[PDB]
Write a protein that binds this DNA or RNA. Structure first.
Lengths: 177, 65, 140, 246, 67
RNA sequence: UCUGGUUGAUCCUGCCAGUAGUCAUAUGCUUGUCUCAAAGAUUAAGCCAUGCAUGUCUAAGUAUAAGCAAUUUAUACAGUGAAACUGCGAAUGGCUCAUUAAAUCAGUUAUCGUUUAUUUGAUAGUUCCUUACAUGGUAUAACUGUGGUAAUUCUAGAGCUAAUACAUGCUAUCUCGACCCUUUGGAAGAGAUGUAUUUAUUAGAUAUCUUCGGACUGAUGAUUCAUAAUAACUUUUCGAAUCGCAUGGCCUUGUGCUGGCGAUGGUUCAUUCAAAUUUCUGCCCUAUCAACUUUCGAUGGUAGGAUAGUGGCCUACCAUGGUUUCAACGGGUAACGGGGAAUAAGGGUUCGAUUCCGGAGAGGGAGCCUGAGAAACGGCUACCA
RNA sequence: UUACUUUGAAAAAAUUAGAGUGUUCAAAGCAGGCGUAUUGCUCGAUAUAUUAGCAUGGAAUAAUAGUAGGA
């Protein structure tokens, strides 16, 4: 089905190129893995060389890193909120790169309690965090940008949205609601 | 899928093949030297033509080139 | 403005620590494209984000280098130049004029106007027709 | 083709093998190895067409499976192994060592070699790099990876390698005034001292060489190969010492 | 040549399909049997001559009433 | 490219006569020797009876053949070896030029934009961490037997038994060093310690005394490169339950400890044989073909998907762009491209399916499995003929 | 500054043009032979931008850039 040659497109001048060969194997494409949220389910695809490549069909958990603290914790992904390519992906809960998902916040706030001796909500300069991040902690979900390619590696790894990106995507969410 | 052996034509018919002076020339040569063929006389004349053409070009080139 | 798109434009893997307070509120990454091309201070102290700017993006300049005369500047961040050359017809023992319109990317760190002489360097395929990148602009 | 070729026609072969164009259609395609395809001498070409120690490929098999041939200290048994340039090929029953090195006419050249000279081998350090666990290595012109080199070894510098331990004995820098062998291109086999490295950026650095009759030519850095200092080649050159004449 | 007359179009079934599609997409710029043709032309001329005959006769009728 | 003819003779314009070759294409007659050599053509890349053209074993993966040799050291096996499992190859070679006119191709570049079986060189002690390693477990083939069918390299049910099949899995070394007494150092104590996948972060910068003996990171023209470190993550990898010849060193005389040559394998990195993209410039006839491309991706931007990877390659959301009288687009080609072949004084012109190189195809659309490598056709599937 | 010119590297073999050699001649084909071989001796093995790219030398031609004001 899918192939990705450049012999079936129009020319640069706007001409129609006649066919040159049959489709080749080294210009194949494969069917997208619309990775949704559910119990973990992952295919393995054999790729050029003998190289394995894991596709994710449904994945629940993920590894999310707090960049300002430089740490990483495994959390549970709740649901996709924003995605800059397709609000149909937002609707159907597809997990891709550059998606904006809400995650659980309990391991992050547990690490924060055990590391700074202070709860969240309701070494002080180190304990001080940002206001929107504190609001999300009080809410119970954290905004995090996915930065992995779950149709390729089968992992959903992201980073918690820090100040400037959080401001931009908060404006985006509030304007698009 | 071999390499081609090279062959080459060893003689060459002259420009005007029928001419009384050249016919009597080849009669003189064939009867005097015991030949049998205009093929043989054209063989020798072709060799001499090649030689004299090479010599003429080396004349026209510069001395001590 | 910088954030005029649906996604957040950024320099990838370049991170500005929020707990660390410094003077320059962003952290910008810039390189020099070699070959004696002076990187512009507008690209050093700019504010744009461009994946294909040869001084700030992930694009190398390598191999061939051309110069051209700009023809059209109507599409976003790419121009079209026109190289001219003299082809030689050995039958008629004289020449003829020809031209090839090569489309080429331009960084937002440059200001081209239709008519000047630019110098472009070959990079990896940016788009369908864009394989070069404007690296040194000169007026006329 | 849908994969790698395994055959080589007779006229497709590299010219300097001196393979005569009637004894068949195929020439020993040299197997993958240390040296590149267009500048390698298979052992069948060396033993049969050059030394005349064999009359057939079956006799070359008989010799190699008898385990007489050693190429750089180690036994080879593949008859199309790519023995390249600056190689040591020892035949023990014949008591000969051969340095493979080019002649002036552009072809390879048997060089009879004694034991004390066969014990080592030059190699053009071509890629110096930092490997895993933070160790440095050099990659010479025959694939030889040598971890832990001297810190002053750079690209394009000759390294004299002790064979029986695979180690770096010493090295020869790349400066003007060294003795330079030329390996590829039109002038290959012309041993001359290097005068000036004309250096461009992104292009190819040319090299101006001047040899003993004070004749001057230009090659590329890819074809230049440093041997030794002025008048002191580390190896023994073939006859004529690499001088092109009239 | 793209549009020749081959030997076996019944074997060149799919070949002719892709060629016809190519011709359509190419000459979209422009769009966006001879004996039978002679019989068609002479048929049109004959039926037109008969219409000329009938209209001639009714004009004769018109003028003979109008005199 | 020339010669002959008008008229008393002469010059140009004319008319006629005369002349040519062609590995050109058919064809006719003749044809003894020696050497050498080719062996397509209906614009039919139209159709095939039969036969063959791809298989493979070393001392070194698996033999209880109810195979053979007896027989002499071999009561686990040991020689040779059908069959079958396993490994590799079948992706090269051979044929043909149907398609394709900036396409293939030629010369020139790039990969700081990727995959690579093999070959070659390097490479991995992680010691401990609470409840078999003198070496775990399942099956299945071939085989024995019971059968089906008009038929094919069809195979079903039942009983065995193996692995380099398949699936599991455990087996100290550095730094500092108080002391001591001094050499030949050895020492209480303090401290550290795999790869692989994915993400986040960090580094990867470089305009005075003497006991004369001793103390006061790299590369490129250029990188987010090589490399290192931190925190976690994984339906998660690897870190040898393999094989041949020999039998030496030890001794607490245990059938205890150690040990040579070499075969297969395996993570990463480099190399080689490659592969895919890729930059400049170059194609025959056509203007009584002047506008063409964009719904159906045409030109660019951003994000994602997909791929080995770049990329409108594809999906979104966006701007309205791109080519052309320097000939775009579309048409014709009895168009595979090139090295090359013929000819003339030079210039040119005409051939090039055809011994080498490259591309494409296997009756024609389409699709895939295995594999490092195929959109394979002496592989498989569906359609048409 | 470029065009244009000079030179150099690059333009696979086979083909072509050349040099050697008594295949019995020839069309072809191929690339040493002697020695006191314990240290040497002899000859030949060259050329083929036709445009693009790369490097280089220029004194013409043809385009192409750059003195002025005030006190």
């Amino acid at each position: 089905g899918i192939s990705r040659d450049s012999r079936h497109k129009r020319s640069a001048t706007g001409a129609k190129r006649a066919q040159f060969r049959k489709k080749r194997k080294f210009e194949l494409g494969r069917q997208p893995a619309n990775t949704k949220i559910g119990a973990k389910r992952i295919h393995s695809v054999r790729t050029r060389g003998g190289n394995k490549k894991y596709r994710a069909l449904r994945i629940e958990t993920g590894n999310f890193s707090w960049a300002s603290e430089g740490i990483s914790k495994k959390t549970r992904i709740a649901g996709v909120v924003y995605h800059p390519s397709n609000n149909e992906l937002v609707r159907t809960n597809t997990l891709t790169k550059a998606a904006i998902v809400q995650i659980d916040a309990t391991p992050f706030r547990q690490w924060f309690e055990a590391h700074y001796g202070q709860t969240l909500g309701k070494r002080a300069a180190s304990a001080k965090i940002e206001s929107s991040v504190e609001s999300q902690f009080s809410a119970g979900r954290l905004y995090a940008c996915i930065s992995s390619r779950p149709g390729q590696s089968g992992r959903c790894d992201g980073y918690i949205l820090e100040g400037e990106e959080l401001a931009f995507y908060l404006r985006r969410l509030t304007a698009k609601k | 899928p071999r390499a081609p052996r090279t062959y080459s034509k060893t003689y060459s018919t002259p420009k005007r093949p029928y001419e009384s002076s050249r016919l009597d020339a080849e009669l003189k040569l064939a009867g005097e030297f015991g030949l049998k063929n205009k093929k043989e006389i054209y063989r020798i004349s072709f060799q001499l033509s090649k030689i004299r053409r090479a010599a003429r070009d080396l004349l026209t080139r510069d001395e001590k080139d | 403005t910088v954030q005029s798109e649906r996604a957040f434009q950024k320099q990838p893997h370049i991170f500005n620590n929020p707990k660390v307070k410094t003077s320059k509120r962003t952290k910008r990454w810039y390189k020099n494209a070699g070959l004696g091309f002076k990187t512009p201070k507008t690209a050093i102290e700019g504010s744009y984000i461009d994946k294909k700017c040869p001084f700030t993006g992930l694009v190398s300049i390598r191999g061939k280098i051309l110069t051209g005369t700009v023809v059209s500047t109507k599409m976003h961040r790419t121009i079209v130049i026109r190289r001219a050359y003299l082809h030689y017809i050995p039958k008629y023992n004289r020449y003829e004029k020809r031209h090839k319109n090569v489309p080429v990317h331009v960084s937002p760190a440059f200001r081209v106007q239709v008519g000047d002489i630019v110098t472009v360097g070959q990079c990896r395929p940016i788009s369908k027709t864009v394989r070069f990148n404007v690296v040194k602009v000169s007026a006329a | 083709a849908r994969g790698p070729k395994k055959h080589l026609k007779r006229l497709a072969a590299p010219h300097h093998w001196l393979l005569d164009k009637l004894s068949g259609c195929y020439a020993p395609r040299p197997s993958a190895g240390p040296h590149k395809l267009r500048e390698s001498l298979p052992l069948i070409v060396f033993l049969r067409n050059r030394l005349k120690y064999a009359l057939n490929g079956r006799e070359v098999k008989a010799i190699l499976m008898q385990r007489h041939v050693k190429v750089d200290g180690k036994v080879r048994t593949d008859t199309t192994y790519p023995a390249g340039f600056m190689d040591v090929i020892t035949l023990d029953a014949t008591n000969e060592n051969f340095r493979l090195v080019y002649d002036v006419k552009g072809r390879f050249a048997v060089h009879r070699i004694t034991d004390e000279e066969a014990s080592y081998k030059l190699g053009k350090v071509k890629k110096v790099q930092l490997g895993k666990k933070g160790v440095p290595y050099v990659v010479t012109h025959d694939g030889r990876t040598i971890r832990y080199p001297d810190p002053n070894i750079k690209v394009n510098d000759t390294v004299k390698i002790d064979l029986a331990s695979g180690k770096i004995t010493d090295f020869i820098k790349f400066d003007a005034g060294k003795l330079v062998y030329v390996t590829g291109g039109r002038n290959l086999g012309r041993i001359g001292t290097i005068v000036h490295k004309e250096r461009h950026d992104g292009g190819f650095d040319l090299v101006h060489i001047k040899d003993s009759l004070d004749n001057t030519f230009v090659t590329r850095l890819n074809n230049v190969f440093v041997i030794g200092e002025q008048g002191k080649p580390y190896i023994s050159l073939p006859k004529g010492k690499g001088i092109k004449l009239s | 040549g793209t549009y020749r007359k081959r030997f076996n179009e019944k074997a060149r079934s799919g070949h002719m399909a892709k060629l016809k599609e190519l011709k359509r997409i190419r000459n979209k710029q422009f769009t966006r049997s001879k004996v039978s043709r002679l019989k068609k032309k002479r048929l049109d001329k004959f039926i037109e001559h008969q219409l000329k005959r009938e209209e001639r006769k009714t004009i004769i009728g018109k003028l003979q009433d109008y005199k």
